[PDB]
Design an enzyme around this catalytic site. Structure first.
Site, PDB file in Angstrom:
ATOM      1  CG  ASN A 293       3.363   4.702   1.604  1.00  0.00           C
ATOM      2  OD1 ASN A 293       4.218   4.245   0.831  1.00  0.00           O
ATOM      3  ND2 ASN A 293       2.559   3.939   2.315  1.00  0.00           N
ATOM      4  CB  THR A 294       4.418  10.885   4.591  1.00  0.00           C
ATOM      5  OG1 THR A 294       3.062  10.444   4.528  1.00  0.00           O
ATOM      6  CG2 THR A 294       4.435  12.412   4.668  1.00  0.00           C
TER       7      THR A 294
ATOM      8  CB  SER B 109       3.944   6.005   6.823  1.00  0.00           C
ATOM      9  OG  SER B 109       3.683   5.885   5.434  1.00  0.00           O
TER      10      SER B 109
ATOM     11  CG  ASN C  10       4.209   1.374   9.453  1.00  0.00           C
ATOM     12  OD1 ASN C  10       3.523   0.907   8.550  1.00  0.00           O
ATOM     13  ND2 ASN C  10       3.973   2.565  10.006  1.00  0.00           N
TER      14      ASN C  10
ATOM     15  CG  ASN D 115      -0.360   0.625   2.409  1.00  0.00           C
ATOM     16  OD1 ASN D 115      -0.361   1.849   2.580  1.00  0.00           O
ATOM     17  ND2 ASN D 115       0.218  -0.230   3.266  1.00  0.00           N
TER      18      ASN D 115
ATOM     19  CE  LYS E   9       2.560   0.480  12.875  1.00  0.00           C
ATOM     20  NZ  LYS E   9       1.149   0.469  12.461  1.00  0.00           N
TER      21      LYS E   9
ATOM     22  CG  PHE F 159      -0.094   9.181   6.427  1.00  0.00           C
ATOM     23  CD1 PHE F 159       1.055   8.834   5.736  1.00  0.00           C
ATOM     24  CD2 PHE F 159      -0.249   8.756   7.733  1.00  0.00           C
ATOM     25  CE1 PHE F 159       2.029   8.122   6.348  1.00  0.00           C
ATOM     26  CE2 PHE F 159       0.732   8.040   8.351  1.00  0.00           C
ATOM     27  CZ  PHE F 159       1.864   7.727   7.665  1.00  0.00           C
TER      28      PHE F 159
HETATM   29  C1  LIG Z   1      -3.599  -0.874   3.669  1.00  0.00           C
HETATM   30  C2  LIG Z   1      -2.745  -0.592   4.871  1.00  0.00           C
HETATM   31  C3  LIG Z   1      -2.814   0.659   5.432  1.00  0.00           C
HETATM   32  C4  LIG Z   1      -2.071   0.966   6.573  1.00  0.00           C
HETATM   33  C5  LIG Z   1      -1.249   0.011   7.136  1.00  0.00           C
HETATM   34  C6  LIG Z   1      -1.199  -1.243   6.572  1.00  0.00           C
HETATM   35  C7  LIG Z   1      -1.942  -1.534   5.431  1.00  0.00           C
HETATM   36  C8  LIG Z   1      -1.836  -2.906   4.878  1.00  0.00           C
HETATM   37  N1  LIG Z   1      -0.470   0.292   8.265  1.00  0.00           N
HETATM   38  C9  LIG Z   1       0.448  -0.723   8.845  1.00  0.00           C
HETATM   39  C10 LIG Z   1      -0.210  -1.720   9.762  1.00  0.00           C
HETATM   40  O1  LIG Z   1      -0.647  -1.004  10.898  1.00  0.00           O
HETATM   41  C11 LIG Z   1       0.807  -2.772  10.201  1.00  0.00           C
HETATM   42  O2  LIG Z   1       1.813  -2.088  10.887  1.00  0.00           O
HETATM   43  C12 LIG Z   1       1.379  -3.590   9.008  1.00  0.00           C
HETATM   44  O3  LIG Z   1       0.441  -3.676   7.941  1.00  0.00           O
HETATM   45  C13 LIG Z   1       1.833  -4.986   9.460  1.00  0.00           C
HETATM   46  O4  LIG Z   1       0.777  -5.730   9.978  1.00  0.00           O
HETATM   47  P1  LIG Z   1       0.057  -6.881   9.024  1.00  0.00           P
HETATM   48  O5  LIG Z   1       1.168  -7.625   8.312  1.00  0.00           O
HETATM   49  O6  LIG Z   1      -0.836  -6.093   8.062  1.00  0.00           O
HETATM   50  O7  LIG Z   1      -0.708  -7.686  10.037  1.00  0.00           O
HETATM   51  C14 LIG Z   1      -0.588   1.520   8.828  1.00  0.00           C
HETATM   52  N2  LIG Z   1       0.125   1.804   9.935  1.00  0.00           N
HETATM   53  C15 LIG Z   1       0.058   3.018  10.538  1.00  0.00           C
HETATM   54  O8  LIG Z   1       0.707   3.212  11.549  1.00  0.00           O
HETATM   55  N3  LIG Z   1      -0.812   3.935  10.016  1.00  0.00           N
HETATM   56  C16 LIG Z   1      -1.569   3.752   8.884  1.00  0.00           C
HETATM   57  O9  LIG Z   1      -2.335   4.652   8.508  1.00  0.00           O
HETATM   58  C17 LIG Z   1      -1.420   2.467   8.276  1.00  0.00           C
HETATM   59  N4  LIG Z   1      -2.122   2.220   7.119  1.00  0.00           N
HETATM   60  O1  LIG Z   2      -1.239   5.722   4.796  1.00  0.00           O
HETATM   61  C1  LIG Z   2      -0.323   4.990   4.406  1.00  0.00           C
HETATM   62  O2  LIG Z   2       0.172   4.908   3.272  1.00  0.00           O
HETATM   63  C2  LIG Z   2       0.386   4.142   5.409  1.00  0.00           C
HETATM   64  C3  LIG Z   2       0.774   4.611   6.592  1.00  0.00           C
HETATM   65  C4  LIG Z   2       1.545   3.802   7.469  1.00  0.00           C
HETATM   66  O3  LIG Z   2       1.984   4.113   8.570  1.00  0.00           O
HETATM   67  N1  LIG Z   2       1.871   2.563   6.991  1.00  0.00           N
HETATM   68  C5  LIG Z   2       1.499   2.076   5.773  1.00  0.00           C
HETATM   69  O4  LIG Z   2       1.798   0.930   5.394  1.00  0.00           O
HETATM   70  N2  LIG Z   2       0.757   2.903   4.966  1.00  0.00           N
END
Ligand SMILES: Cc1cc2c(cc1C)N(C[C@H](O)[C@H](O)[C@H](O)COP(=O)(O)O)c1[nH]c(=O)[nH]c(=O)c1N2
Ligand SMILES: O=C(O)c1cc(=O)[nH]c(=O)[nH]1
Ligand SMILES: O=C(CCNC(=O)c1ccc(OC(F)(F)F)cc1)N[C@@H]1CCCc2ccccc21
Ligand SMILES: [Cl-]
Ligand SMILES: [Cl-]
Length: 355
Positions: free
Chosen positions: A183-184, A181, A243, A111, A214, A115
């Site tokens: 992606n920023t 993240s 993450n 992904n 995190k 944000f």
């Molecule tokens: C589509 C999507 C979107 C997000 C995320 C993941 C995914 C797949 N993750 C990360 C998530 O919280 C986690 O840290 C990782 O995805 C690893 O856990 P899993 O392997 O998915 O169980 C994530 N983490 C975070 O701190 N803020 C966010 O806004 C997001 N957004």
């Molecule tokens: O919004 C996202 O792109 C995002 C945020 C984050 O902390 N981790 C992630 O995998 N995606």
């Protein structure tokens, strides 16, 4: 369980792109259109950490309910805690679509949402509408975490996080800041977290959340050493580890493996576990860790707990296997704890380091 994993979830996967599936899943969850989870949590799964009781140690990770729309539905699914966000100060749209990709052959997702966020004010009002319901849930062992992001255009990241502390801190049992993240200096991390903790400490006592950092799994050894040092120096309440990864482990098969973004799911699992193990050791086991990355079974959860996690989260596995995975993880974890001679989750936390 087998119906969702083998029949239902693979079929819906064919009709929807991943972001549309995400949007529908949030809507269905918010409406409670899911069977109330049947698994009744054993006392063996209760964990007391971060100033709260957690009825079970399996949470929903940030990024599923970014805007705080489905909290009650997530508890109904059987999660022992819910983390919403990331929430940015001002609303922002995130990256252009497509920005979410499934890698079914890898049980992974990539992904690059960027944000996308309804922003602090909207989320504040959403949480306020259920604030006392949440207080009762928290007292009953079902805490709420809020993950705070920063806007793409911000000129002062620390002020973005400070605004988040001020606005959503009073509504959260714990707050999260990513230092992750995709992606920023150490003194800059210290400066940022000092400001965050000062703002948190300025909230009235019943509105004062724990603060966690995190981290990504992609940190250098130096980064991890520095983070551990700052966390201990400042009294940060815990770490979320990890993450998604911007690495691409060898062996990914999905056609979309070279899309930009954070990779989650099974290929992240052991990278995350190893990061937990390192951060637990670097903090002498004195800093609670929420372990996350690639958890889809009781074994996955127990590996993170034994590596140092007091709680775990999952996300990607829920999206492949559906709600039944939550009870599956919990049931398998209980069984493994019994098999391995642990009285409960608490006895297993960090157990690998005592071998
Ligand atoms: C589509 C999507 C979107 C997000 C995320 C993941 C995914 C797949 N993750 C990360 C998530 O919280 C986690 O840290 C990782 O995805 C690893 O856990 P899993 O392997 O998915 O169980 C994530 N983490 C975070 O701190 N803020 C966010 O806004 C997001 N957004
Ligand atoms: O919004 C996202 O792109 C995002 C945020 C984050 O902390 N981790 C992630 O995998 N995606
Ligand atoms: O696509 C996947 C992996 C495989 N699963 C599906 O394609 C899928 C399809 C329909 C579905 O049923 C629902 F009712 F439509 F939701 C549930 C899941 N994950 C995405 C990307 C990341 C965020 C997210 C959140 C919820 C669901 C899927 C996803
Ligand atoms: Cl308040
Ligand atoms: Cl195991």
């Amino acid at each position: 369980e087998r119906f969702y994993a083998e029949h239902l979830m693979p079929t819906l996967q064919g009709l929807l792109d991943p972001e549309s599936a995400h949007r529908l899943a949030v809507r269905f969850t918010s409406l409670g259109l899911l069977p109330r989870a049947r698994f009744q949590d054993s006392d063996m799964l209760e964990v007391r950490v971060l100033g709260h009781k957690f009825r079970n140690p399996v949470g929903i990770a940030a990024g599923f309910d970014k805007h705080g729309e489905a909290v009650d539905g997530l508890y109904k699914m059987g999660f022992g805690f819910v983390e919403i966000g990331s929430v940015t100060p001002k609303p922002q749209e995130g990256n252009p679509r497509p920005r979410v990709f499934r890698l079914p052959e890898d049980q992974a997702v990539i992904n690059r949402y960027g944000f996308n966020s309804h922003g602090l004010s909207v989320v504040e009002h959403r949480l306020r509408a259920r604030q006392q319901k949440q207080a009762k849930l928290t007292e009953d062992g079902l805490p709420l975490g809020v993950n705070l992001g920063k806007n793409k255009t911000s000129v002062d990241a620390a002020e973005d996080y400070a605004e988040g502390v001020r606005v959503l801190g009073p509504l959260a049992d714990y707050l999260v800041v990513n230092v992750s993240s995709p992606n920023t200096g150490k003194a800059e991390l210290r400066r940022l977290l000092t400001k965050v903790l000062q703002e948190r400490d300025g909230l009235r006592r019943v509105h004062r959340p724990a603060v966690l950092v995190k981290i990504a799994p992609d940190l250098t050894s130096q980064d991890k050493e520095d983070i551990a040092s700052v966390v201990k120096e400042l009294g940060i309440d815990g770490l979320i580890v990890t993450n998604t990864t911007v690495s691409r482990p060898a062996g990914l098969q999905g056609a979309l493996r070279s899309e930009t973004g954070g990779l989650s799911g099974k290929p992240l699992r052991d990278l995350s576990t190893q990061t937990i193990r390192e951060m637990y050791a670097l903090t002498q086991g004195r800093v609670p860790i929420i372990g996350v990355g690639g958890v889809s079974s009781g074994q996955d959860a127990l590996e993170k707990i034994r590596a140092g996690a007091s709680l775990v989260q999952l996300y990607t596995a829920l999206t492949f296997w559906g709600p039944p995975v939550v009870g599956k993880v919990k049931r398998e974890l209980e069984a493994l704890l019994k098999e391995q001679g642990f009285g409960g989750v608490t006895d297993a936390i960090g157990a690998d380091h005592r071998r």
